[PDB]
Design an enzyme around this catalytic site. Structure first.
Site, short mmCIF file in Angstrom:
data_model
loop_
_atom_site.label_atom_id
_atom_site.label_comp_id
_atom_site.label_asym_id
_atom_site.label_seq_id
_atom_site.Cartn_x
_atom_site.Cartn_y
_atom_site.Cartn_z
N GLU A 33 7.10 99.34 -84.78
CA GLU A 33 6.46 98.06 -84.50
C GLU A 33 6.04 97.34 -85.78
O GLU A 33 6.10 96.11 -85.84
CB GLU A 33 5.26 98.25 -83.57
CG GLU A 33 5.60 98.94 -82.26
CD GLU A 33 6.77 98.30 -81.54
OE1 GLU A 33 6.85 97.06 -81.50
OE2 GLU A 33 7.61 99.05 -81.00
N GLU A 41 16.29 94.92 -83.73
CA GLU A 41 15.99 96.31 -83.40
C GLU A 41 16.59 97.29 -84.40
O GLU A 41 16.04 98.38 -84.57
CB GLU A 41 16.49 96.63 -81.99
CG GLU A 41 15.66 96.01 -80.87
CD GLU A 41 14.58 96.95 -80.37
OE1 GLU A 41 14.78 98.18 -80.42
OE2 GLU A 41 13.52 96.45 -79.93
N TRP A 84 35.22 100.73 -61.05
CA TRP A 84 34.02 101.12 -61.79
C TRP A 84 33.99 102.63 -62.02
O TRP A 84 33.65 103.08 -63.12
CB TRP A 84 32.77 100.67 -61.04
CG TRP A 84 31.53 101.42 -61.42
CD1 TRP A 84 31.03 102.54 -60.83
CD2 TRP A 84 30.62 101.09 -62.48
NE1 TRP A 84 29.87 102.93 -61.45
CE2 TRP A 84 29.60 102.05 -62.47
CE3 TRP A 84 30.57 100.07 -63.43
CZ2 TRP A 84 28.54 102.03 -63.38
CZ3 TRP A 84 29.52 100.05 -64.33
CH2 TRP A 84 28.52 101.02 -64.30
N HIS A 87 19.25 96.34 -66.18
CA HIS A 87 19.69 95.14 -66.89
C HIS A 87 20.67 94.32 -66.06
O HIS A 87 20.64 93.08 -66.11
CB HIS A 87 20.32 95.53 -68.23
CG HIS A 87 19.37 96.21 -69.16
ND1 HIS A 87 19.14 97.57 -69.13
CD2 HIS A 87 18.59 95.72 -70.16
CE1 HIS A 87 18.26 97.89 -70.06
NE2 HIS A 87 17.92 96.79 -70.70
ZN LIG Z 1 11.98 97.60 -80.90
#
Ligand SMILES: [Zn+2]
Ligand SMILES: *[C@@H]1O[C@H](CO)[C@@H](O)[C@H](O)[C@H]1NC(C)=O
Ligand SMILES: *[C@@H]1O[C@H](CO)[C@@H](O)[C@H](O)[C@H]1NC(C)=O
Ligand SMILES: *[C@@H]1O[C@H](CO)[C@@H](O)[C@H](O)[C@H]1NC(C)=O
Ligand SMILES: *[C@@H]1O[C@H](CO)[C@@H](O)[C@H](O)[C@H]1NC(C)=O
Lengths: 195, 596
Positions: free
Chosen positions: B357, B384, B459, B487
């Site tokens: 962070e 990220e 799939w 997601h």
């Molecule tokens: Zn992160």
């Protein structure tokens, strides 16, 4: 033995907006800078032309007591030979400027939760600023190729914006109060020496 | 006057107005997050709606600037970002139907529950029942029941909603000068107008396929190792030649193989590197953890956190009356207002996530001088990656010895290094095939290569072909298993997790090329190295003002995404796996099924 009224200017309750920065003309009194020279109740003091190390023995004609409040990161723009938002639209100093500048933080006073819309500054202008000029116009700035008709529309903006001073800004965005003491000297008896 | 001059002032006004409105919205959201009250919810909704309405009106106004007559790259980028139509191009009835469909899908995903027959009352949600059952239970039948029940009690409510969502999103994308929605998502990596640093929207698929093809052998060896260990775990349920059943991969969907570590320890006689005891013993609090993180970031030349960060951030769970979310997050409200929200605990995992962070905060702080529209990473994978590189640098035993936290008598041997590399590979290597497979399936479903009546049939084909994962229970066409994931049912892109995993390993070694490191790449640390810090800051300060190819080249010296540094990093474990797989078979047969 008249003391110049430097005491009542620093601790005033409020200062005007950036584009309505306050000026005071001071003459025929005694001003002693040794009070603030070795006390350090402020944060930043710097200046050009006259050395603070005991140069009050000289004589000056008049003293200008310019005062306003701006953003922190813009404190750099109050200096000779500088360009920026403040140096182009709000306040422009001469290249050979002689005088002193004192800037100090005012977060405990000018910061209010949910904003402090009371301080205004110009954002758009049609040209640059001549040295020591005033701007109190409210005309609509024209950016397009059509008349604005006095109303905000396509390519028409209000030239004034308000600082949203709130006590949770970073040090750059926090309000800083600036006082510029200019020692104007010309061909004159120059009774304002400050022994 | 010139059109660019007519647009510069508009951009200035938009910046000066959007800064304040974004600050108001972020402040309201933060107040909700740190204090859950009804008035806070109303205030945050009002602020968010005001900001969204202002953004939409400004976009509608900006759509009147002809981009074809503007040459300045920065102004073109800003106006292209501000000129997007979004979903407004769709008809009002269609837009309302799409919003209702999205809300219904999210509600079904986050509200549904599962329970066995004869227990209509005690029904478990996704957490903390299904996740704990998947990650802790070792019973074959219970895991199979949980998997099939979650996939059968949710997908039915998702399949028609998903089909209508696909149709509506495809027609919205087509109405906005795009081939399909997949092209709209791929447009994030598109670069145009720069000579020698261009990127095509169709080049991303080619690069991803090339990278996966050159990755493949390491994944094959790792899959063989994991399969042998699982076979030893289940004596009469896994074939020596078959694929891995989907209900035995740690979590619900098999995205990560981390939970398999307890069943795949190479040398079980040597304990892992757990330094919780030393953390507790020395009277160490959250403030000390964050001061150590700040010192580690200072040692490489990056600036330190300001006083506002210390005053305003919430580094400890309030407890008592206040209820707050404990998911760590680095908040950038703007105007020098940076915060970190986390419920710190005395654990090495919290020690690493603090560095993560803080790296996020440093990267946010780096590009604070950019205009409002360019205050984000170069693409959806850089940010990220910069977060994770800090944790990689700080996790080495050298750094933990540099803070006086481990006994100097502790000497690293090859066994601990093998354990650490296997633990890292069970998370890094074990997710790339899954990410690539799911993104490929979604891309080709949007494109129309797969007819609806065959969706599931395709799939699960890739699960046998790419991921090497087999179905425990046969599935009919009515199921909608892929939509059960987080997601996919919330309209989220899922390829950022791929490129990031590569990008970080390109950055790391590059910094180690300025730290003069000698030896393997799994023990490099960038601490006490100003050159690496300056090299990283050169990329960080740019933000989105330049094409991501230039940003990548400014650090690694390459103009494209590459995976060779990943294999360089994993070389020791690769050699160990190659030595260990002398008797095991590499590969799998797709036609094998547990139920024959
Ligand atoms: Zn992160
Ligand atoms: C949280 O909100 C409640 C009501 O909105 C208020 O009474 C309380 O003081 C708040 N807590 C803090 C720490 O401000
Ligand atoms: C765009 O305009 C900026 C002025 O802010 C200038 O610095 C930059 O060089 C210009 N770039 C191009 C490609 O015109
Ligand atoms: C979509 O954007 C184009 C230019 O990008 C614009 O001409 C068009 O009007 C927009 N659509 C709508 C419905 O306004
Ligand atoms: C951060 O580093 C600067 C170095 O320029 C230093 O002056 C400052 O005191 C540091 N901050 C704190 C809280 O110590």
């Amino acid at each position: 033995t008249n003391l110049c009224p430097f005491d009542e200017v620093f601790n005033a309750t409020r200062f005007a907006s950036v584009y309505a920065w306050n000026r005071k003309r001071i003459s025929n009194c005694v001003a002693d800078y040794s009070v603030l020279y070795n006390l350090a109740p402020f944060f930043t003091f710097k200046c050009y032309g006259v050395s603070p190390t005991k140069l009050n023995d000289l004589c000056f004609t008049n003293v200008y007591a310019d005062s306003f409040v701006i953003r922190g990161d813009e404190v750099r723009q109050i200096a000779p030979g500088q360009t920026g938002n403040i140096a182009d639209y709000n306040y422009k100093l001469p290249d050979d400027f002689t005088g002193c500048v004192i800037a100090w933080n005012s977060n405990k006073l000018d910061s209010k939760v949910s904003g402090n819309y009371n301080y205004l500054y110009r954002l758009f202008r049609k040209s640059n600023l001549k040295p020591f000029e005033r701007d109190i116009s409210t005309e609509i700035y024209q950016a397009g190729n059509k008349p604005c008709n006095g109303v905000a529309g396509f390519n028409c903006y209000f030239p004034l914006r308000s600082y949203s001073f709130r006590p949770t800004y970073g040090v750059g965005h926090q309000p800083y109060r600036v006082v510029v003491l200019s020692f104007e000297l010309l061909h004159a008896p120059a009774t304002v020496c400050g022994p | 006057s010139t059109i660019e001059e007519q647009a510069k002032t508009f951009l200035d006004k938009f910046n000066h107005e959007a800064e304040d409105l974004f600050y108001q919205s972020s402040l309201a959201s933060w107040n909700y997050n740190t204090n859950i009250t009804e008035e806070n919810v109303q205030n945050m909704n009002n602020a968010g709606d005001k900001w969204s309405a202002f953004l939409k009106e400004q976009s509608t106004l900006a759509q009147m600037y002809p981009l074809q007559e503007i040459q300045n790259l920065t102004v073109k980028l800003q106006l292209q970002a501000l000129q997007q139509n979004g979903s407004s191009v769709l008809s009002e009835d269609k837009s309302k139907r799409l919003n209702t469909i999205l809300n219904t899908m999210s509600t079904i995903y986050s509200t549904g529950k599962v329970c066995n027959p004869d227990n209509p009352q005690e029904c478990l949600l996704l957490e903390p029942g299904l996740n704990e059952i998947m990650a802790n239970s070792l019973d074959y039948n219970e895991r199979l029941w949980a998997w099939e029940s979650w996939r059968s009690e949710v997908g039915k409510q998702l399949r028609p909603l998903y089909e209508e969502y696909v149709v509506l999103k495809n027609e919205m994308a087509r109405a906005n000068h795009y081939e399909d929605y997949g092209d709209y998502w791929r447009g994030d990596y598109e670069v145009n107008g720069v000579d020698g640093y261009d990127y095509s929207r169709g080049q991303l698929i080619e690069d991803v396929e090339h990278t996966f093809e050159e990755i493949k052998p390491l994944y094959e060896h790792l899959h063989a190792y994991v399969r042998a260990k699982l076979m030893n775990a289940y004596p009469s349920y896994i074939s020596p030649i078959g694929c891995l059943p989907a209900h035995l991969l740690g979590d619900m969907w098999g995205r990560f193989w981390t939970n398999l570590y307890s069943l795949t320890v190479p040398f079980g006689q040597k304990p892992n590197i757990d330094v919780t005891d030393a953390m507790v013993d020395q009277a160490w609090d959250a403030q000390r953890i964050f001061k150590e993180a700040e010192k580690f970031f200072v040692s490489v030349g990056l600036p330190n956190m300001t006083q506002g960060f210390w005053e305003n951030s919430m580094l400890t769970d309030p407890g008592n009356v206040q209820k707050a979310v404990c998911h760590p997050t680095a908040w950038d409200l703007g105007k020098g207002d940076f915060r970190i929200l986390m419920c710190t605990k005395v654990t090495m995992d919290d020690f690493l996530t603090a560095h993560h962070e803080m790296g996020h905060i440093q990267y946010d702080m780096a590009y604070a001088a950019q205009p409002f529209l360019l205050r984000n990473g170069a693409n959806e994978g850089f940010h990220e990656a910069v977060g994770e590189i800090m944790s990689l640098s700080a996790a080495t035993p050298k750094h933990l010895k540099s803070i006086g936290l481990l006994s100097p008598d502790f000497q690293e041997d090859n066994e601990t290094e093998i354990n650490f590399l296997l633990k890292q590979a069970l998370t890094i290597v074990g997710t790339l095939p899954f990410t690539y497979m799911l993104e490929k399936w979604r891309w080709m479903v949007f494109k129309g290569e797969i007819p609806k009546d065959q969706w599931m049939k395709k799939w699960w084909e890739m699960k046998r072909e790419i991921v090497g994962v087999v179905e425990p229970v046969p599935h009919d066409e009515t199921y909608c298993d892929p939509a059960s994931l987080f997601h996919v049912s919330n309209d989220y892109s899922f390829i950022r997790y791929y490129t990031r995993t590569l990008y970080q390993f390109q950055f790391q070694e590059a910094l180690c090329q300025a730290a003069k490191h000698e030896g393997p790449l799994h023990k490099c640390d960038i601490s006490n190295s100003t050159e690496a810090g300056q090299k990283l800051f050169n990329m960080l300060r740019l933000g989105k003002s330049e094409p991501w190819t230039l940003a990548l080249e400014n650090v690694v010296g390459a103009k494209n995404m590459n995976v060779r540094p990943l294999l360089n990093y994993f070389e020791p474990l690769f050699t160990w796996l190659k030595d260990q797989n002398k008797n095991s078979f590499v590969g799998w047969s797709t036609d094998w099924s547990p139920y024959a």
